[PDB]
Design a protein around this ligand. Structure first.
Ligand SMILES: Nc1nc2c(ncn2[C@@H]2O[C@H](COP(=O)(O)OP(=O)(O)O)[C@@H](O)[C@H]2O)c(=O)[nH]1
Ligand code: ALF
Ligand SMILES: [Mg+2]
Length: 313
């Protein structure tokens, strides 16, 4: 009986790691379970297109083609069905024309300037498929869903003859007050960090850099004497989004003294060292770091397999 606790700031990938356990250790989501997320997919998709159109006003960005104005009006007239688990070929068209508009795209490419779901493009780019009549979300569609965790979620599974009890909590500031309820008998903590957060700000605070917040959290948990005997595993998550982002957005936004290049390998090791540096007992305490893509099942499988042997030692 092993107890794992998934900690980290909001949207770091904790719940997505939990979803993988089902796919990797069980048999993935059944049809009835996939259908349950159908409305979340649609809700997520409609909320993402609205967040972009909402930002265009704030940033004063015009549509590329004047006619998009009617489509934008139609969107709100029709948005209500989507939430109920319904997508009409009419609504689908509206969203598709909007998504392809150059002004909408220009706004999309300035997303660090507001709050947008990591999966907006994933879904918006796959509209034809997800809008089909009789659509049932795929395993990846489920993994891509965004649903806020509030409270404590407990999940169980068997792996390598061990019975796992995985604990997951909410990372927003207002939720952190609930973390101490899970502190008992923890075999290992899996601290999730979103690498692509380096240039974003807190949903709960536009004055606070998202990566700095994680550092504050990791420093706290890692050096908490209560966890002196718990294995600290660090997942430097969203390696796939970081890879694409490092090429165009400067890391000096987060770490002003970074003198390396806009490359993945070099910028990734740097962030690793920043976090590993917070450990105050480097000779007595070990940090087990892994770079991950929580939405990629094969990646998570090989990484979880390695993490368990560590737990098995
Ligand atoms: N592309 C990409 N998105 C991810 C990854 N990890 C999680 N996501 C997406 O990021 C969003 C937030 O993750 P979630 O697991 O809800 O985070 P929590 O708030 O920490 O539980 C969800 O829509 C996920 O599908 C990753 O490595 N790559
Ligand atoms: F934003 Al998270 F679980 F911390 F939804
Ligand atoms: Mg969660």
């Amino acid at each position: 009986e092993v107890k794992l606790l998934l900690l980290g700031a909001g949207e770091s990938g904790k719940s997505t790691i939990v979803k993988q356990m089902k796919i990797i250790h069980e048999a993935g989501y059944s049809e009835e379970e996939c259908k349950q997320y159908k409305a979340v997919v649609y809700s997520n998709t409609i909320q993402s297109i609205i967040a972009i159109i909402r930002a265009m006003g704030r940033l004063k960005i015009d549509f590329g083609d004047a006619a998009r104005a009617d489509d934008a009006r139609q969107l709100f007239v029709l948005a209500g069905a989507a939430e109920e688990g319904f997508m009409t070929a009419e609504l689908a068209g509206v969203i598709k024309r909007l998504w392809k508009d150059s002004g909408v795209q220009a706004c999309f490419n300035r997303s660090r300037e507001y709050q947008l779901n990591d999966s907006a493009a994933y879904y918006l780019n796959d509209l034809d498929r997800i809008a089909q009549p009789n659509y049932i979300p795929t395993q990846q569609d489920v993994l891509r869903t965004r649903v806020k965790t509030t409270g404590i979620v407990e999940t169980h599974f068997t792996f390598k003859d061990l019975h796992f009890k995985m604990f997951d909590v909410g990372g927003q500031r207002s939720e952190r007050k609930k973390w101490i309820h899970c502190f008992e008998g923890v075999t290992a903590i899996i601290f999730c960090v979103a690498l692509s957060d380096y240039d974003l700000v807190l949903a709960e605070d536009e004055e606070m850099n998202r990566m700095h917040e994680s550092m504050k959290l990791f420093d706290s948990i890692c050096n908490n004497k209560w966890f002196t005997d718990t294995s600290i595993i660090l997942f430097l998550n969203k390696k796939d989004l970081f890879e694409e982002k490092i090429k165009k957005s400067p890391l000096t936004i987060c770490y002003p003294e970074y003198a390396g290049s806009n490359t993945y390998e070099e910028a990734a090791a740097y962030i690793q060292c920043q976090f590993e540096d917070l450990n105050k007992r480097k000779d007595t305490k070990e940090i087990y770091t892994h770079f991950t893509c929580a939405t990629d099942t094969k990646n998570v499988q090989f990484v979880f397999d390695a993490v368990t042997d560590v737990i098995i030692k």
